[PDB]
Amino acid sequence: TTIAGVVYKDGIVLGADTRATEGMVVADKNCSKIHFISPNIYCCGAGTAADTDMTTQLISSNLELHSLSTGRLPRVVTANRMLKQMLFRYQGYIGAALVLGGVDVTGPHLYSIYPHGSTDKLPYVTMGSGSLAAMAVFEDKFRPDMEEEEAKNLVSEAIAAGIFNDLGSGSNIDLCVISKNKLDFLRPYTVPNKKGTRLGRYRCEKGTTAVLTEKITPLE
Amino acid sequence: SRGSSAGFDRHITIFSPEGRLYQVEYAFKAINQGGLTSVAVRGKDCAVIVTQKKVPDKLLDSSTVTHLFKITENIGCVMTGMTADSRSQVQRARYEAANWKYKYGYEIPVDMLCKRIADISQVYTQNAEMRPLGCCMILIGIDEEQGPQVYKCDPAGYYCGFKATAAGVKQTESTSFLEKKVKKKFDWTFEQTVETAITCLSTVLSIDFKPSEIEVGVVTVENPKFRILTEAEIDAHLVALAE
Amino acid sequence: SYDRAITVFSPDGHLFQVEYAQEAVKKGSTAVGVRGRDIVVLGVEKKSVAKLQDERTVRKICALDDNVCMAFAGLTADARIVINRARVECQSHRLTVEDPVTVEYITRYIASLKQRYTQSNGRRPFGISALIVGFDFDGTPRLYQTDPSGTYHAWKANAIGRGAKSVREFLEKNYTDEAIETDDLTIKLVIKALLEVVQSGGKNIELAVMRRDQSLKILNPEEIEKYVAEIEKEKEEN
Amino acid sequence: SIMSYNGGAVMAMKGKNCVAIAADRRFGIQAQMVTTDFQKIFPMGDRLYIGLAGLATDVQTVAQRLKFRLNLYELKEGRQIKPYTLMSMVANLLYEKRFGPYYTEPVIAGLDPKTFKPFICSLDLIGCPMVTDDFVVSGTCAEQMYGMCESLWEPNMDPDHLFETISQAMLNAVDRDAVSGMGVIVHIIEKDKITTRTLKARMD
Amino acid sequence: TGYDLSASTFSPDGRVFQVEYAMKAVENSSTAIGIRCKDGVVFGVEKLVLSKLYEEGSNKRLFNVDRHVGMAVAGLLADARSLADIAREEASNFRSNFGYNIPLKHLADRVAMYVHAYTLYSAVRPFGCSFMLGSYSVNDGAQLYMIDPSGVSYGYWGCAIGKARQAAKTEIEKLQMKEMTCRDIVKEVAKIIYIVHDEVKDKAFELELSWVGELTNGRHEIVPKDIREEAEKYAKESLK
Amino acid sequence: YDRGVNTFSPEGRLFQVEYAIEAIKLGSTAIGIQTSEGVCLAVEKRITSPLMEPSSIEKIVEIDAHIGCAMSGLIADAKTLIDKARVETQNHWFTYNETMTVESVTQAVSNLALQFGEEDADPGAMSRPFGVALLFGGVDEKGPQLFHMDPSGTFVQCDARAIGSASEGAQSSLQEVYHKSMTLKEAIKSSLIILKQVMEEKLNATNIELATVQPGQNFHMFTKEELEEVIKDI
Amino acid sequence: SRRYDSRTTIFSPEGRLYQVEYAMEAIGHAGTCLGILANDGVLLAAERRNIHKLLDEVFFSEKIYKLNEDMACSVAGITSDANVLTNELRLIAQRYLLQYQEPIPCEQLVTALCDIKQAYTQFGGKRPFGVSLLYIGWDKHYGFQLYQSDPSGNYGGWKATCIGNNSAAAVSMLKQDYKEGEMTLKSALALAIKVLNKTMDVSKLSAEKVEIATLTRENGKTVIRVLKQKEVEQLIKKHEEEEAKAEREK
Amino acid sequence: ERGYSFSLTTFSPSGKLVQIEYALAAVAGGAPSVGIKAANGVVLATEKKQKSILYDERSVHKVEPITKHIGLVYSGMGPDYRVLVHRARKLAQQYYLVYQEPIPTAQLVQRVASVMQEYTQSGGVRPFGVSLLICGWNEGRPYLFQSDPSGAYFAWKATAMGKNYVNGKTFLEKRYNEDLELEDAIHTAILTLKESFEGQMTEDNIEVGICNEAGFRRLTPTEVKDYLAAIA
């Protein structure tokens, strides 16, 4: 529930947390909140995770069809416009707040998309429940035309702040960098949180539990 | 003299014994029925469509019979065959281009527009309940990363990219002129391209046309919006080619 | 979307499609139906016995309810769909009335279906003539015959399909009030009527009988054999 | 509360290369228990089981429709279902009812048809894919089951230890829950066999 | 057969004989002429008097499709009425969707596209009517577009549709109509229509004449009666 | 095939409707007589074989308690129109608390008539015209009435009309023996004797269906005993 | 459209239906299919015509498909019609399975297919599916049971039947050499090999020219096994040996 | 738009779809194409003979991909090929959306066959005048499918559609090996193409796509002419 994106001197850097939770308890620590769309387009989704996943899959399929028909690389602008029109057709009932980053023929682009269908092109965008911490980190340590490492560190710090100041994000950070030339998608970018081992290991063997019936049906 | 017909093979577009579609191939000569020849060429950085303007009578407003249509700002087109069919295809192309612009956020590439128009023409060819729009459209534009582009659809629908081609009664003669010109000269500038475009019509049809007897459209990489030449530019190019 | 008028009035107002459906009915298998004073009997020629064949699936006599049954003559597939639609109509009537179905009402709505197909767009009528046997509430035997033209009429006895005219003209002279008093005489009458049609006599023939609301059953092959022997006994003494 | 209307508890973890999936057996209305022999784990393949939790009617309907489309696919295609494909297909099935969602949170467990690599995943009422290597749980017992698993689960487990761990997990997660339990069914999918067992749980 | 039975098929050469028969059906009808000038567009249409029991102004071939657009028709008059209804429907739609009166150029383009749309399918037949639309605007001036039954719309300094269309065109060529005065052009239209009318071919006849232009405050209207008798007298004198 | 369902003749009429009229003369003979004391309808059954039950062979149908109808032609096609007429009469009663007038029933039947085509309306519609001529006998506020419904939709109010196989000639003879001041008994006697004379076969109670509508009584169909009572004098 | 319609969904002056007659004739010159019943199973023999060496032949079976868990089919005629028919049959069989939680009876599924085929012949204006279908299966009510259906919509239940070229000769061979009620799987298989060798005498019995399928009931489970190429070679060898033995004894 | 509800394709008295035979004749009269299988991939080759060089042969493409792992070529009419490939692309995208896994080539060919059958048995429509050679890779295996205008399909190790197609098939049979490599497959395909090119093939006139475990990819004229030089 903490995703962010930024444009640096070369292209786009996208980042996301991994604490996918339903209700109030953590359901997963390895959510894939940075969806692939095109070899030059990625999008980070927040909110109803199923809706975000279906939206990203549909956009990826539509841009696959478009690019393969036109013989050109997919555009961030066409993806953004399709997202806007579809979400607006559903009047925001698709609980998906998206950060669409990518590099196209006209240059790197970053867009903030709201579930009601509103979109905006901004150099740095944060979204999710923990969006405010990452937004503050960006407003504090953002510069125009930053280097690759500076952008990566800034996004990492923003995700770390969102993780440590929100109760719906953590346990990993995901990064994806898109440029004019190279696309990198490093999922376990940095694991700022570890787990201590169980001090007293407690294990059981057969005969510790009570079983009523056994049924073996060997397969081949 | 015993004008027999083979049922409906020669009457509606169904598969003929010779593996042909008779009403599809009638459209090729339906292009000729218009009696007008349109030839288009592209330079290294420009694309020029030159078309003779027919004036069967002074009593009609010849300033309003211009057959060059701007599909978008940067896409111009000209058609051959039935003029009503030409207007319908121009309207459909404008609709599709605008729809692509809204649905995809940027101007439609000329190749994709030609592909969509060709698919619509194939919709007519496939169906056996509609006239297969016996009209041929040729369109121009300026494309990034690829340069000036000229595309041409057809009632059959088989389109292709090309340096230069023509549609009309004397499209074969214009094709021959294009063959001889491409085998003679290769390097083309803007003025050479426009001079060759005028020379194609002049050599093929041999009319010594007046300045008002043609309508010419150009797309250049200085203001990629499709612009139509007026009488001043027509006379300038005429005298330049003459000298 | 398919709405081409198939059934149209030819010159002199003759429905040539109806005539062709009648031709298909005539070329179809032979079926007969008698309405005895106590029972109703249907007899179908199982022509081309074609051994190694499960005759259960090709049985042309199908029961619609506990008191209604029909035997067709014509197209087997149109017969099957009409039997399905008649099962639908009988069940719908039983639901909406919670009373036992009426043979005449069933035949009437089948005739209405046939007339709708004659009057419809893009459709052709059902090339089958149906003999509907059954019993009313009071146990009154009912025998009706409907044709692809849509007309249905009640008959004391009749025949449909191949040789239908010959069989019905034989029955109209062989039918007497005292000849259908008991099940034995009715079965013998139907068997001697179909004997002129079926070459085998006993093995290329199938008989079904319905009593007054008594769970109609199909006649056993041994019963058919012994009753053909009985009619031969009558023949030798007469 | 609609998913707790009937109650439920389903889990699935991974072994060294085998899989354990277990579920409660109690079926009844919010108040009374009707049947204690209800089946909640259904075979979507020879080496692939699926557990469903939530509204019992939605469980049964989703299972029937899933078996419908799965059988159609496998008859059209000629290969046993791949677990990832089954999970994606059921997730799509749940998403098709975005405005009419089935109040069910299912889990899918099994082995790769050719690799026999363990696979487990979970969904929600909309059908959100959730692939977690260690374990996935669903139902009204969610908190108890998560707490049990996050300490009882270890990587690279033999089938017998895997069964012991999952059996203890279900037993100790349903005995502290009121709308689930009354018998636990456990399926252990090993490389070349499956073992189906009923635990000696408290029936009340 | 096969090449002239429907508008959805080409001739072996690629012709549309149904549209050619529609052209025949619009040619054999009565004459209808439209002249545009620098300050107005006039229409003079020829009415066949089947019997004197008819009213003057009955079965008008002049329709008023927009607040400023007229329509002079020839061919099947019921088809002409239907096309006038379609034209006024299109004008109403444009006014509703854009808040101002439709320009004549786009009106004619849309109507011609509609006409051509019913020349493509075997489920319909091409219209048996040709029609000229005249309008005026403060920024555009006087405009006149003629539309064929095929669906082709062109601007005409002056056009004629009917039997004597070519004769009317040829004799009126002496007029430099592109910078003339609407009032006198009405009289010249009366003249040309009287000469091109064949009294022997049609003994009984009537004229329906109208203009639209700057003198009309940019709204289509019929000729006032007094100008009608004066133009009729001028035409009688020009008959010589 | 080739010719459509909406095709006229060179002289300007539907030859399909002409074929329908030809089928009308192919139909069974029916007779209707209207008098001041009611209206009578009769029809010949045309029994094919004695095995056919006379009960199911009835060409006279009740539209309402005050309306009877005689059909000639495609008797299978006539029952749908009869059901439509009855449901329309009952709708009129349900709406206006009165019995529907016979003339309005005939007009509505004409509205249903000649409504068919290939692609002209909803696909679930008629393809061919009704091939049945109808005689609507009835009693209403305008006294006894009788209407000849032609399949063309050209409905007619006629005092007496004979239709079917022996329509013409028999209708002229009926007119000659018909008067403007005949009683109901005279009407039934005349209709019965004309039908007996025009019978193609020896008629009896099992060869004819008779019905009447009276100003006081409802629509009553003559049973066998009264049929024999009225036919023995003729 | 009156002149240019094909009006394939109307009657004929003599009462027949030309479209179904032509479909049956085309099926007659189409591939060979044979179905037989044994006391412990039912066997199918399907003949593949296009046997070019360029075939990948990776499929388990070409004209033999599996309608549902306990019923198999053999198609005769247009293979694309066959594919669309087969997946429609699978769809409706699984529909019955969903609706009743019981394997769909073979008679039920055959009746449904014949209903839809008859309706498609009845109207729609389209050319009928010119494919004959031969269904085998096992059910609670009749167990092993096989049907032959026709493009006209008519079906019949048989102990054994064949479709394709020399259909009359094949059915004569069945009527001569089929032991009703006493046909084991081995003797049924031998009779099937005999038919495959005889009803298509041109291009005499070849392993790759035909495909063999069996359907049995083991432990209350319907097992559909497609005999492999080595199995078909074993059948060919057994047929050659038995024919040689019969001729030598003759 | 009304739409004819009567199928233009009808059963002849002999039962042969003579209309489909004419469609196949149009396929034969169209430009030829070949497809071939290797032990570890599929190669599709075809020729694009335009008119005189005024056509920009580079601008248009004939080999088309459906997915990253599926490509195809056609013999016949380009207008039909465009709509058919576009519909196949839609079907593959829909399958990927539903099942989150790449389309198997067999299932895609089955869907295309169903589309062709619907076209042939429906009303108001002309049968497709193309034959598709479809290459695909899935589950670490190669697949090459012939799909005819009749709507049927086959898995063919080698095929040749168009003019001289029977001779091309025989030539492939003579020069086909069961365990050849992709290099041998390219050699055989180019050899067949030059044996049936009729007019001195050129790197521009030959367009080739290769499908293997790395996916499907179309060879650019550089390596195209490189392989033609290596093959002679």
UniProtKB/Swiss-Prot annotation, chain B:
Sample GO molecular function, one term:
endopeptidase activity
List locations, semicolon-separated.
Answer: Cytoplasm; Nucleus
Share an example GO biological-process annotation for this protein: positive regulation of canonical NF-kappaB signal transduction
Q: Which residues are glycosylated?
A: S4
Q: Which cysteines are joined by disulfide bonds?
A: none
Positions of modified residues (Phosphoserine): S16, S62, S63
The main location is: cytoplasm
What InterPro entries does the annotation carry?
A: Ntn_hydrolases_N, Proteasome_alpha, Proteasome_alpha-type, Proteasome_asu_N, Proteasome_sua/b, Proteasome_subunit_alpha6
PROSITE patterns on file: PROTEASOME_ALPHA_1 (PS00388), PROTEASOME_ALPHA_2 (PS51475)
Key words, A-Z: Acetylation, Cytoplasm, Glycoprotein, Nucleus, Phosphoprotein, Proteasome
Q: Does the keyword Plastid apply?
A: no
Q: Which family does it belong to?
A: Belongs to the peptidase T1A family.
| Role noted for this protein | Component of the 20S core proteasome complex involved in the proteolytic degradation of most intracellular proteins. This complex plays numerous essential roles within the cell by associating with different regulatory particles. Associated with two 19S regulatory particles, forms the 26S proteasome and thus participates in the ATP-dependent degradation of ubiquitinated proteins.
Question: What is said about its interaction partners and assembly?
Answer: The 26S proteasome consists of a 20S proteasome core and two 19S regulatory subunits. The 20S proteasome core is a barrel-shaped complex made of 28 subunits that are arranged in four stacked rings. The two outer rings are each formed by seven alpha subunits, and the two inner rings are formed by seven beta subunits. The proteolytic activity is exerted by three beta-subunits PSMB5, PSMB6 and PSMB7. Interacts with ALKBH4.
Organism in which the protein naturally occurs: Homo sapiens (Human)
Swiss-Prot record, chain C:
Q: How is it modified after translation?
A: Phosphorylation by ABL1 or ABL2 leads to an inhibition of proteasomal activity and cell cycle transition blocks.
One annotated GO molecular function is:
identical protein binding
Q: Which residues carry this modification: N6-acetyllysine?
A: K226
Sites carrying sugar chains: S129
GO cellular component term of the entry, any: extracellular exosome
* Induction, per UniProt: Down-regulated by the ribozyme Rz3'X. Up-regulated in colorectal cancer tissues.
Q: Keywords in UniProt for this one?
A: Acetylation, Cytoplasm, Glycoprotein, Host-virus interaction, Nucleus, Phosphoprotein, Proteasome
Superkingdom to which the source organism belongs:
Eukaryota
Where is this gene product found? Cytoplasm; Nucleus
Q: Which GO terms describe its biological process?
A: proteasome-mediated ubiquitin-dependent protein catabolic process
Q: How does it assemble?
A: The 26S proteasome consists of a 20S proteasome core and two 19S regulatory subunits. The 20S proteasome core is a barrel-shaped complex made of 28 subunits that are arranged in four stacked rings. The two outer rings are each formed by seven alpha subunits, and the two inner rings are formed by seven beta subunits. The proteolytic activity is exerted by three beta-subunits PSMB5, PSMB6 and PSMB7. PSMA7 interacts directly with the PSMG1-PSMG2 heterodimer which promotes 20S proteasome assembly. Interacts with HIF1A. Interacts with RAB7A. Interacts with PRKN. Interacts with ABL1 and ABL2. (Microbial infection) Interacts with HIV-1 TAT protein.
Q: Which family does it belong to?
A: Belongs to the peptidase T1A family.
Q: What is this protein called?
A: Proteasome subunit alpha type-7
Identify the taxonomic lineage of the organism of origin: Eukaryota, Metazoa, Chordata, Craniata, Vertebrata
UniProtKB/Swiss-Prot annotation, chain G:
Species name: Homo sapiens
Q: What induces it?
A: Down-regulated by antioxidants BO-653 and probucol.
Q: How does it assemble?
A: The 26S proteasome consists of a 20S proteasome core and two 19S regulatory subunits. The 20S proteasome core is a barrel-shaped complex made of 28 subunits that are arranged in four stacked rings. The two outer rings are each formed by seven alpha subunits, and the two inner rings are formed by seven beta subunits. The proteolytic activity is exerted by three beta-subunits PSMB5, PSMB6 and PSMB7.
Covalent S-S links between cysteines: none
Family, per entry: Belongs to the peptidase T1A family.
Where N6-acetyllysine occurs, the residues are K126, K175
Q: What is this protein called?
A: Proteasome subunit alpha type-4
The protein's matches in SUPFAM superfamilies, at most eight in alphabetical order, are given as:
N-terminal nucleophile aminohydrolases (Ntn hydrolases)
Q: Which Pfam family, any one of them, does this sequence belong to?
A: Proteasome_A_N
| Sorted UniProt keywords | Acetylation, Cytoplasm, Host-virus interaction, Nucleus, Phosphoprotein, Proteasome
Instruction: List the InterPro entries hit by this protein, alphabetically.
Output: Ntn_hydrolases_N (IPR029055), Proteasome_alpha (IPR050115), Proteasome_alpha-type (IPR023332), Proteasome_asu_N (IPR000426), Proteasome_bsu_CS (IPR016050), Proteasome_sua/b (IPR001353)
Quote the NCBIfam families the UniProt record gives: PRK03996.1
Source lineage = Eukaryota, Metazoa, Chordata, Craniata, Vertebrata
Show the PROSITE patterns listed in the entry: PROTEASOME_ALPHA_1, PROTEASOME_ALPHA_2
Swiss-Prot record, chain H:
The identity of this protein, by name, is Proteasome subunit alpha type-2
**Which gene is annotated as encoding this protein in its UniProt record?**
PSMA2
Q: Which family does it belong to?
A: Belongs to the peptidase T1A family.
Q: List residues, modification Phosphotyrosine.
A: Y4, Y22, Y74, Y119
* Gene Ontology cellular-component terms listed: cytoplasm; cytosol; extracellular exosome; extracellular region; ficolin-1-rich granule lumen; nucleoplasm; nucleus; P-body
* Keyword DNA-binding among record annotations: no
Modifications after synthesis and translation: Phosphorylated on tyrosine residues; which may be important for nuclear import.
One GO term under biological process is: response to virus
Q: How the protein assembles, per its UniProt entry?
A: The 26S proteasome consists of a 20S proteasome core and two 19S regulatory subunits. The 20S proteasome core is a barrel-shaped complex made of 28 subunits that are arranged in four stacked rings. The two outer rings are each formed by seven alpha subunits, and the two inner rings are formed by seven beta subunits. The proteolytic activity is exerted by three beta-subunits PSMB5, PSMB6 and PSMB7.
Concerning what turns on (or off) its expression, the entry says: Down-regulated by antioxidants BO-653 and probucol. Down-regulated in response to enterovirus 71 (EV71) infection (at protein level).
Annotated InterPro entries: Ntn_hydrolases_N, Proteasome_alpha, Proteasome_alpha-type, Proteasome_asu_N, Proteasome_sua/b
Identify the CDD domains for this entry: proteasome_alpha_type_2
The alphabetical list of record keywords is: Acetylation, Cytoplasm, Nucleus, Phosphoprotein, Proteasome
Q: Which residues carry this modification: N6-acetyllysine?
A: K68, K169
Short name of one Pfam family for this protein?
Proteasome
Q: In which compartments does the protein localize? A: Cytoplasm; Nucleus
Question: Sites of the modification Phosphoserine?
Answer: S5, S12, S14
